[PDB]
Amino acid sequence: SKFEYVRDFEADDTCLAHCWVVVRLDGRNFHRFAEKHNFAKPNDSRALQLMTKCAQTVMEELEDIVIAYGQSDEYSFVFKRKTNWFKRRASKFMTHVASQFASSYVFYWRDYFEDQPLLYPPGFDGRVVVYPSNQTLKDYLSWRQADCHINNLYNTVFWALIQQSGLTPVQAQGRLQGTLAADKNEILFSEFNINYNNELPMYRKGTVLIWQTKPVPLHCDIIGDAFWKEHPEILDE
Amino acid sequence: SKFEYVRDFEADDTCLAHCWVVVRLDGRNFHRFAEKHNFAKPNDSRALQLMTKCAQTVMEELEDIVIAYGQSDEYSFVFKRKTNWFKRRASKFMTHVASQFASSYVFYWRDYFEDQPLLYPPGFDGRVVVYPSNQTLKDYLSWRQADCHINNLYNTVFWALIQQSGLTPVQAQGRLQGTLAADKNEILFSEFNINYNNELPMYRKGTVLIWQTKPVPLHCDIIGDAFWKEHPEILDE
Amino acid sequence: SKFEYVRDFEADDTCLAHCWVVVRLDGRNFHRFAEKHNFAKPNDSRALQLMTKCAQTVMEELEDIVIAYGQSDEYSFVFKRKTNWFKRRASKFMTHVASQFASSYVFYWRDYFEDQPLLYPPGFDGRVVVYPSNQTLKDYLSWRQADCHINNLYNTVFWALIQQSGLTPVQAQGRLQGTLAADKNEILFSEFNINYNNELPMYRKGTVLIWQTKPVPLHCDIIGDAFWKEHPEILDE
Amino acid sequence: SKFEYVRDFEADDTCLAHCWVVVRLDGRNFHRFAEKHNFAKPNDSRALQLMTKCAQTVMEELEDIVIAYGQSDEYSFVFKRKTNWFKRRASKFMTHVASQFASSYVFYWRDYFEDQPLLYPPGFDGRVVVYPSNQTLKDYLSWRQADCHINNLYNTVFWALIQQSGLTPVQAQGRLQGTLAADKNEILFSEFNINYNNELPMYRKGTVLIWQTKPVPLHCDIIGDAFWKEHPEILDE
Numbered sequence A, B, C, D: 001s002k003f004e005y006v007r008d009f010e011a012d013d014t015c016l017a018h019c020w021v022v023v024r025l026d027g028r029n030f031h032r033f034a035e036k037h038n039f040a041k042p043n044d045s046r047a048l049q050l051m052t053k054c055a056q057t058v059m060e061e062l063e064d065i066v067i068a069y070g071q072s073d074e075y076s077f078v079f080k081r082k083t084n085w086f087k088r089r090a091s092k093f094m095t096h097v098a099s100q101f102a103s104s105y106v107f108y109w110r111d112y113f114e115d116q117p118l119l120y121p122p123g124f125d126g127r128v129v130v131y132p133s134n135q136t137l138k139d140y141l142s143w144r145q146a147d148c149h150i151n152n153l154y155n156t157v158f159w160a161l162i163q164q165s166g167l168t169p170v171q172a173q174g175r176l177q178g179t180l181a182a183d184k185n186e187i188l189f190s191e192f193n194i195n196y197n198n199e200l201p202m203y204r205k206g207t208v209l210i211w212q213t214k215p216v217p218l219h220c221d222i223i224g225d226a227f228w229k230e231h232p233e234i235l236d237e
């Protein structure tokens, strides 16, 4: 050797046994990316589906992933809790998911933005997070979907006031400050004749991914017991 | 909130202060990748330069990277020890580097393999490693370059016995087993008239990357004090 | 400051939320300790009760400890899973438990070994371990009690062959090698007229500690659902 | 097994190679302890020497400790950077030091407080901290000694105003608020005829411990190059 001792400094990063491991990817500086690639506000069917695409690439190229959830510039992958893939080394789980996803992005870019030219190669960030119980995991997801629902309902009526109402951003925010759920939902139905509840289920619920085999996308609620009692092969395994 | 508590389970991963942080990327299952994309043995000018390309993308899109080194299906990025980028969160450092690199790969694929068609989107793995001293860091690099030199000298004469000598792999390995440095180096000069020491400096030394501004590639030795006394802006900062 | 920056190098050690934290203490070089303080084989009522003593000291001086279990030169303390004591910093949990226990040992030494003189100050080691589920925690305990039962049944018949049978250690081990449960249990009943099942419940079951208030010691089985259905205030909290 | 799988949940805690490991002990609730055991303000020769005692116990019973430093209710042990004791497992280093120290405390209590009766068994806390360079380590110590010097100079004149000047605490603090170094140092020399610089070197410099063999206590400055150039066997090893 004479130099291989340096390998000793590599610290362990094993994830806690019998726990759900979760890798959450989120595009870097994507606010600036959507700009330069003219993304549709508040939702851009192309983007969401490209992301859902990459997501599947990942769910197929990697392993033990029993579910994924996407929304905005992000995706979460939930590996089977008894996974033994890579000895549960957190560093592996996050870097493979992250790299795979990022190379799949530029790859399938044309399939979704046939007209639009990818200006530069995009960045993504990762992280691993361990959830000890099905409840905590479930809660994690709900935290995400719910985050989605709170952002879409905000952006939908936020951009309708800028575009279809001709208001500068600084205004639309000043006008929506303090509004409740029914508050915004009304500003839509009555101020733009938009019935939120009719919006695409991929904008107000995000995207789910399950095996059916292959990773079939869905836009159903995952916060309610129903979805889970309907799909028990996912958690009790 | 009502669900945001789940965020609390995200464990710290801060890297030890005043230490060199190092991210080392290495292509996944690349043995099978080089196969399907017909890579040249023992070296493939295209591959090495694409890698060196991505590497620069990374050194520009990210920050505080004072040096990089590449070889085979890998690259190491050494961030400035007093870096404060991302509060030294190991998870960030590795996933950005990994994702960026992977998206840049498919992006600039044509520029290097204009003829060859990228068959699928490639995978990369990451990791962070902290080195407490300039000596240990330097040793790390030497470990890499030296690893490079030991593999190239082995593969060069390993493939010359299979290709230009018509030997099955199982043979060439049985014939090289136990050979010393001068042993292989001779099997070349006298059995194929190949003077190893004349081989491309990018095959037997790998690739280095420094600022000159922009990331200029080099193929000089980094194991010898010379290189460092010649470039002190890199370590003593 | 001018020197306080060094405080920054103190790494986080927070234990995973909603998880059972467990500190397990085990006397250092106690084999040599029991020797010099003439401990009774295979059990020494003094030792076990001193340990159970210290254990209570700990359960009172520290907090959120919902249960403890002792045996041989060790004790395990199980903190309430939603504990927030010390922000769940693993380093605190283990060092307080360890120090407290060690000072209580020398303190109450006379109360248990009134005749015997403590020769030197004894050492103890600690560690923290996180268990994600009640099942895993329960399993942990069973692992301990069961370890206890497997050692006591071995030592009881191991020392009866050395003392009451006049056999050198090397022999008694050669004679017990390969024996089953009923094998040793018989070597007792028929070779020394000792009915194992009649042995003190503190030798073959160890010691448990629960609040009743104060930490009341017990010597009942904790591997069987009974104990738990009998004491639900412990886990479901 | 059938239960031993639970052992798998024990996470690694290895300290970074080629780095100074440091265990810092600090008495728990000692403010209340000194009270009940009538400690002398601002310094109590008994306490400081008992602590320095325990400290030596530790430096002898454990290993690779190349130096220690004490002051107030605390002590720091600095293990030799290339130590391999316990595979550098942080959990071991801190719990042994902590337990050993705590049992030695109650043990040698009489030798220092022959008159005073130890009321209850005392608590201590631990932690491990890794320093990458001799400079950072040195700085750590200076941080401690300097902390000592800043507290002793504050307490000395803080208690002289309460005792020898008959002022309630709330006052003495209101009077010392905003004073500089020369400010307090003068309030002494001129208001109580006390020349600080003449105070015991164990009160304004703390305590150091080196091998000479055995752990010989000292009260010299360790912040100045002198001490180190005078003792090079400690760091360059």
Ligand SMILES: Nc1nc2c(ncn2[C@H]2C[C@H](O)[C@@H](COP(=O)(O)OP(=O)(O)OP(=O)(O)O)O2)c(=O)[nH]1
Binding pocket: A026, A027, A028, A029, A030, A031, A032, A034, A039, A040, A041, A042, A043, A044, A047, A048, A072, A073
């Ligand atoms: N117009 C448009 N922009 C979108 C859409 N989905 C995501 N984005 C963009 C704008 C959002 O600021 C961004 C996602 O939020 P982030 O918090 O990740 O912001 P950003 O990516 O700048 O931050 P980060 O990369 O995490 O540092 O992606 C979409 O459907 N349409």
Ligand SMILES: Nc1nc2c(ncn2[C@H]2C[C@H](O)[C@@H](COP(=O)(O)OP(=O)(O)OP(=O)(O)O)O2)c(=O)[nH]1
Binding pocket: B026, B027, B028, B029, B030, B031, B032, B034, B039, B040, B041, B042, B043, B044, B047, B048, B072, B073
């Ligand atoms: N023909 C050819 N293959 C190359 C060249 N550079 C790298 N490779 C391939 C073959 C090597 O097995 C591989 C790099 O070694 P690795 O140990 O990373 O193997 P592999 O990527 O299969 O493992 P891993 O992905 O780490 O699990 O990349 C090249 O210039 N020419």
Ligand SMILES: Nc1nc2c(ncn2[C@H]2C[C@H](O)[C@@H](COP(=O)(O)OP(=O)(O)OP(=O)(O)O)O2)c(=O)[nH]1
Binding pocket: C026, C027, C028, C029, C030, C031, C032, C034, C039, C040, C041, C042, C043, C044, C047, C048, C072, C073
């Ligand atoms: N005679 C006697 N010895 C006992 C009794 N309880 C414990 N011991 C002693 C002998 C055992 O070897 C030791 C506990 O087992 P350990 O595996 O902890 O051994 P030891 O303490 O030497 O190792 P360690 O300190 O963990 O490095 O304590 C007892 O009741 N009677």
Ligand SMILES: Nc1nc2c(ncn2[C@H]2C[C@H](O)[C@@H](COP(=O)(O)OP(=O)(O)OP(=O)(O)O)O2)c(=O)[nH]1
Binding pocket: D026, D027, D028, D029, D030, D031, D032, D034, D039, D040, D041, D042, D043, D044, D047, D048, D072, D073
């Ligand atoms: N009278 C007196 N008290 C002392 C002496 N040395 C230490 N102490 C006591 C009073 C100080 O508040 C205490 C050491 O400071 P700490 O910050 O450790 O306070 P305390 O032990 O309450 O906090 P902790 O246990 O860390 O939670 O020990 C001494 O020589 N004389």
Ligand SMILES: [Mg+2]
Binding pocket: A026
């Ligand atoms: Mg983010």
Ligand SMILES: [Mg+2]
Binding pocket: A026, A027, A028, A029, A030, A031, A073
């Ligand atoms: Mg983002």
Ligand SMILES: [Mg+2]
Binding pocket: A026, A072, A073, A074
């Ligand atoms: Mg986002």
Ligand SMILES: [Mg+2]
Binding pocket: B026
């Ligand atoms: Mg590898």
Ligand SMILES: [Mg+2]
Binding pocket: B026, B027, B028, B029, B030, B031, B073
């Ligand atoms: Mg590879």
Ligand SMILES: [Mg+2]
Binding pocket: B026, B072, B073, B074
């Ligand atoms: Mg490789």
Ligand SMILES: [Mg+2]
Binding pocket: C026
């Ligand atoms: Mg042990």
Ligand SMILES: [Mg+2]
Binding pocket: C026, C027, C028, C029, C030, C031, C073
């Ligand atoms: Mg032991």
Ligand SMILES: [Mg+2]
Binding pocket: C026, C072, C073, C074
């Ligand atoms: Mg034991």
Ligand SMILES: [Mg+2]
Binding pocket: D026
């Ligand atoms: Mg403290």
Ligand SMILES: [Mg+2]
Binding pocket: D026, D027, D028, D029, D030, D031, D073
């Ligand atoms: Mg204290």
Ligand SMILES: [Mg+2]
Binding pocket: D026, D072, D073, D074
């Ligand atoms: Mg203190």
